[PDB]
DNA sequence: TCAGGGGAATTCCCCTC
DNA sequence: AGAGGGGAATTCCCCTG
């Protein structure tokens, strides 16, 4: 039967979540292949069905238990945190550009979560899957307006109080839900929604972009233990590593880490370290290796920089 | 007649202002001559008068107009921002230890300021000097009993709205006011108040501590621009200078600033720059020069570190 | 501009005596 | 095991191109 397939996922890292105070129009959530000039965006595709339909996007949690996220989606076609756009009549592919991720305050988690749960219940956008199964009977029953009862508000507040202590404000996910038309033509037939890759805030120190801005000495001796200063982006002294590596044997790898202490990490932006020992200390020609910044917890690679080992 | 003399002023820089959230036990305001083990505190002395008296201390602003400051003084003898202590019979020496400077939020400045202005009018603590000259008639009538009128509250609120946007939250001053007894014995005869030195918050980037944490090359050549990386504390790229200096017996004033661009200042904590040319390029012996970080606005001295120029 | 980025203000938490 | 600081994370502000 018909389903929804994510053609291009959003970029997991590099995007910066912004609060209401930071202002508007600061960038759109880019695609996984959104290099400079080759600006791409998250794309989905409704398969096994040809014709006009609608696609909604909502923010969900990163944990095993999928639930609504207090963060919102801001931009055009987005109202109250949900972005709704009509798919092409023939191009069953849908792209999402100019999507910002509104970061909520920790104190304003409960308030925003409850408000957007109320919205998701009045609009019937997967009420039982994200809030609570007790309200999984509101699959757009009726046309348009769907006033809520008193017990339904009770369930909303119960789900909100329980999901406040379990929400990571630094990571979100995209849930794409497709809606196929019915008899009257209104988009109401809901197929299985699909969750996107995890989206990590750039303001989170454990998931930012690892970049080697500058190095004082770009070429050391094959012996090693030479002091080098590396100016970098924001890194955590207890969760940072400087890795020299070279591809060898056409398949094999050579690693080697700089010997530095967390005290040598100067205020998250600079590291004074010492070069490790190379393989062939009895080398004859200067060998070329790459250097990167690797997070010990995430094992995330920084963009490598050239480095050279010279004999003595 | 009798006056009040500040024996030891507080240390102008080095102390960090703290908000209500940061807690209570983060340090006491040290004196200008304080050091480790030699723990000193701001002290004053009532001169030309022997006997019991009273000394109050209040926070005032730095600027042309001396006025109450939204920041408060926290501690034992301090209540609602004013620290009152009896000089004791025949002691006449007054010390002020365990004094913290409560940093208020920008949003809650006005609320606090007006709240402390009314108090200064109800208690008669220099109302015309600190609040507004129109209220320079509020002395000695009552120490709490004298409720204020409506026009007085209008003047207080006007002074508060005008001085909220005119207050520097990063610098304060201490005002000591002495009170001699009268016939009935109540301390009400006000002596001339004395203002202390300016106290600059260490967490303010324009008044922080200038420290040379690390240098890539600690000895360069007299030839000229050699690139060296300097790891430092928080400095402002548009208001920072790297000064090479040497005191000599022939006038002994040689200045010379490192050739760096504000772009070379890596995230306020590192500067990649080039050493300037010293005098006597045709030297024969290695000459020693010292290095500092000098703030462009304040011309404040950093802790010097050794450096040397060798010929070619 | 809209797309970013740096940095300041504010809150929270850890390291060394 | 706690005060004194200091660093780091979380929100907020606004400058640049």
Numbering used by the authors:
A (entry chain A), B (entry chain B): 39 to 350
Provide the publication's sentences verbatim.
NF-κB is a family of evolutionarily conserved transcription factors that provide stimulus-dependent temporal control over target gene expression. Despite its original characterization as a repressor of target gene transcription, the NF-κB p50 homodimer was subsequently shown to be an active transcription factor through its association with other nuclear factors, such as the IκBζ co-activator protein. The resulting crystallographic model reveals the well-characterized DNA-binding NF-κB RHR (also commonly referred to as the “RHD”) composed of an amino-terminal domain (murine p50 residues 39–239) and a short interdomain linker (residues 240–247) followed by the dimerization domain (residues 248–350).
To address these questions, we engineered a “Test” DNA containing the core κB-like sequence 5′-GGGGAATTCCCC-3′. We embedded this core sequence within ends of different sequence and length so as to impose asymmetry in crystal packing and unambiguous identification of DNA orientation during model-building and crystallographic refinement and determined the X-ray crystal structure of the resulting 16-mer DNA in complex with p50 at 3.0 Å resolution. The resulting crystallographic model clearly reveals that p50 binds the Test κB-like DNA with 11-bp spacing. Moreover, since the Test DNA does not contain a central A:A mismatch, the binding is inherently asymmetric. Base-specific contacts between p50:Test and p50:IL-6 are largely conserved. One notable difference is that, in the p50:Test complex, Lys241 from subunit A binds to the available fourth G base, as expected. This is significant because, if the p50 homodimer bound DNA with 12-bp spacing, then it could accommodate both triplet G binding by the loop L1 residues and a second favored Lys241:G interaction by subunit B. Rather, p50 binds to the Test κB DNA with 11-bp spacing. Therefore, the p50:Test complex X-ray crystal structure strongly suggests that 11-bp spacing to κB DNA is the preferred binding mode by the NF-κB p50 homodimer. Furthermore, it illustrates how the preferred binding of a two-fold symmetric p50 homodimer dimer to 11-bp within a two-fold symmetric κB DNA necessarily introduces asymmetry into an otherwise symmetrical complex.
